[PDB]
């Protein structure tokens, strides 16, 4: 039975990665409110933190969160293979990162602005406001807002 109570060790709505986590949901599906964290990248991080996956966010400890931080911004360290990372072979760098938090679109604006100055056709599309992966813009996406 999972029916345990405790009392005042429970805390809902805590901050992570300069963003604020939901109070109570299964932690894998909890931390995902941070951009750069998917339904899996949270599933694999929580396992490596020895956290109960069927516990809830307001549970665990204060330090167990601080360990989840480590595995997230140091993913290549914790046996998480490179292909589980979004940032693999990052442009000029060559290293495999995982871009997280509010850092996600900053790295996104970076490659965007990168090939904007390269003036490739794929980038020009972004500047025009058009579709890049594209295909037919003929009949699709109209009244785009």
């Amino acid at each position: 039975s999972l029916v345990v109570q405790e009392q005042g060790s429970f805390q809902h709505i805590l901050r992570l990665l300069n963003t604020n986590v939901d109070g109570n949901i299964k932690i894998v599906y909890a931390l995902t409110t941070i951009k750069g964290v998917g339904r899996r990248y949270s599933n694999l991080v929580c396992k490596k933190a020895d956290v109960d996956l069927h516990k809830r966010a307001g549970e665990l400890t204060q330090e167990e969160l601080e360990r989840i931080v480590q595995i997230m911004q140091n993913p290549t360290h914790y046996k998480i293979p490179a292909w589980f990372l979004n940032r693999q072979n990052d442009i000029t760098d060559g290293k495999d990162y995982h871009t997280l938090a509010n850092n996600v679109e900053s790295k996104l604006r970076d490659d965007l602005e990168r090939l904007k100055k390269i003036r490739a056709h794929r980038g020009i599309r972004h500047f025009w406001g058009l579709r890049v992966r594209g295909q037919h813009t003929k009949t699709t996406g109209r009244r785009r807002a």
Binding site: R119, A120, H121, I124, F127, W128, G129, L130, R144
Partner: peptide, 29 residues
């Protein structure tokens, strides 16, 4: 591609500003 991305002119917001002609709806014979 220089004037292409340097163009003010051509764009989406540019076309999205002015509105559609009457020719979109026309047919028969």
């Amino acid at each position: 591609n220089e004037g292409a991305i340097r163009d003010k002119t051509a764009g989406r917001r540019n076309n999205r500003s002015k509105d559609v002609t009457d020719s979109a709806t026309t047919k028969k014979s």
